[PDB]
Design a protein around this ligand. Sequence first.
Ligand SMILES: *[C@@H](CC(=O)OCC)[C@H](C[C@@H]1CCNC1=O)NC(=O)[C@H](Cc1ccccc1)NC(=O)[C@H](CC(=O)OC(C)(C)C)NC(=O)OCc1ccccc1
Ligand SMILES: *[C@@H](CC(=O)OCC)[C@H](C[C@@H]1CCNC1=O)NC(=O)[C@H](Cc1ccccc1)NC(=O)[C@H](CC(=O)OC(C)(C)C)NC(=O)OCc1ccccc1
Lengths: 306, 306
Amino acid sequence: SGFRKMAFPSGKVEGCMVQVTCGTTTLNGLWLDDTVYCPRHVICTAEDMLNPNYEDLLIRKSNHSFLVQAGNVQLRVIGHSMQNCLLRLKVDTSNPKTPKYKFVRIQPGQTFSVLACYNGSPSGVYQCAMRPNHTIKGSFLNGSCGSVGFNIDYDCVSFCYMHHMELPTGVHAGTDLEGKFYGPFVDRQTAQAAGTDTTITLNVLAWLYAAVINGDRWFLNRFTTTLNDFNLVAMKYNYEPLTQDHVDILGPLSAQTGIAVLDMCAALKELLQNGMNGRTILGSTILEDEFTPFDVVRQCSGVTFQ
Amino acid sequence: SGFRKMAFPSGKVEGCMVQVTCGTTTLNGLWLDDTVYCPRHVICTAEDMLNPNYEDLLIRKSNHSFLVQAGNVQLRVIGHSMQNCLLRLKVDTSNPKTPKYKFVRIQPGQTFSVLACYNGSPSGVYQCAMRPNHTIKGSFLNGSCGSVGFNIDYDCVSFCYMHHMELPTGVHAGTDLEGKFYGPFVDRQTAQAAGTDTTITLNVLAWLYAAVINGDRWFLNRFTTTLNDFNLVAMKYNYEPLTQDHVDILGPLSAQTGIAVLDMCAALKELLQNGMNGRTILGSTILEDEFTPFDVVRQCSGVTFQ
Ligand SMILES: *[C@@H](CC(=O)OCC)[C@H](C[C@@H]1CCNC1=O)NC(=O)[C@H](Cc1ccccc1)NC(=O)[C@H](CC(=O)OC(C)(C)C)NC(=O)OCc1ccccc1
Ligand SMILES: *[C@@H](CC(=O)OCC)[C@H](C[C@@H]1CCNC1=O)NC(=O)[C@H](Cc1ccccc1)NC(=O)[C@H](CC(=O)OC(C)(C)C)NC(=O)OCc1ccccc1
């Protein structure tokens, strides 16, 4: 037993990280087959980060403007294109370590692992959720751009995030691997602020199931709720409204614990209203919202500690 | 910025995981050079887990009693020895993916990354602290034995933990890579309980420095304390006593933030006494004790957000 924020093993992603340099700007890139992906802001001039015109900046570059390094090996750039907010650099060598991979756009509430990288060298790995306001609560310093987020299914890597910026609340913004931003953000240093966030109701509920699977029932109650009555309380506490789809997603967890979803919702409504009374749930004093139902099924025993 | 429980990138360790089978018992092993390490309890008979005599069980085995699998490749066992609570199986092939590595015994309070594995296939990675009571708060199911804990320095892997058991509180026990248990535990299913735990004072303090580096000062106060007066409060709240060595270790963090350690101790004494008043510190409502000063320096900016 136990319950931890668990990241995917990062080795298949480590073998894909390189360093990309244009002038005196260096950041991370992702090398799959004969292509290296990286934030287009690598081509920004030091005094024009406010209003860069990337089409105009990019046409002024050649293939040899870009320096790509994999460990100690220089990879020769032989073609380049811009795709939304990324660059695609074609190189002379196909990555021998390219895993099976897909590019996916993840959805708010879903989680992924981040491989924080600096100068093309991986330094750490942690799990993040895509927030409802399309930011992540990551941990990134200068040099971290081009670090990627991913999930692994069987032996296929689903890349879903490349890192681009930090906003003033200390939260993080970036794109999928087609270069489209998550959220309304743009890759320029003009003032921008994350919209107000919301708590991910489906995940809080999934995590309550985890706590039960793992043997704790203290927070349950004799009550039930309608979906609509629940959502009135949810709006009050800045929780996302719960939908029938969310209820259907909780099906398997519900089945495993013998707890109907709306009974679990009633339990959660009581927690919101009354607090936790100095008690913890899976070691936590707050209601945790960064584990999906998928994450709970992946980590917990298939057998409830009854 | 941001602050996350961050694990080391796990790729160098992934390339070392294998499956080891004796009869109908399968668990994980670690393959370095021409040796595979695994818990000796892989040789336990199904009806004798209470009182196994391992010397007696082991002499009844041959090299071909053990089946070692790396991915789809059978590795032939050609020698075996017991070392404390582990087995060392000599195999026909040296691991081509063996990284630079060391075996280290870590000390209570220190942290490491765990690569949870099942049937020789890595499934997840998370950070753990060695608790003062010599257990870890991990996340492990049946099949997880032989999963390892490690740190990485430059490109050297310091292996420090192999997993062996779960105790009744849902916490975890195991050995270093010489096979000596952390704590008073033994590898038999006879009743055993973790000693009462203590909060890791040095880490709580390191994490308060992190919160300051990252720009928050709300919890500071105008006061100072003596080491001895601090420890009277620490005993009250079940915190480890703070030592001059711990104060000297906080030197660099202290220097970076301009906060004397004993002023930070006074701040912490006020937090223990008064609570947090509904406020959070680096997103947390509890005083977190699983980040070392090393972990904070590794993750935070070298420049304080003043
Ligand atoms: C990665 C790029 C890199 O490798 O290092 C850059 C030298 C870096 C990652 C962040 C740095 C700290 N932690 C991170 O997650 N990205 C950037 O620095 C990114 C570069 C950029 C983006 C677009 C065009 C050109 C260059 N810039 C930002 O993240 C800035 C950071 C910042 O705080 O800048 C100000 C000093 C506030 C201007 N973020 C940003 O511009 O947010 C929009 C904004 C601007 C002004 C006021 C409010 C909000
Ligand atoms: C890994 C071995 C494996 O790959 O699966 C085993 C089939 C496994 C890891 C734990 C399982 C659940 N989560 C884990 O972290 N290890 C064990 O199962 C280990 C096997 C063992 C150890 C020593 C000799 C022979 C076999 N056994 C334990 O961890 C047991 C678990 C348990 O709860 O057993 C009882 C049902 C309580 C007997 N732990 C244990 O024996 O703790 C001591 C104890 C015994 C009796 C009362 C209180 C405490």
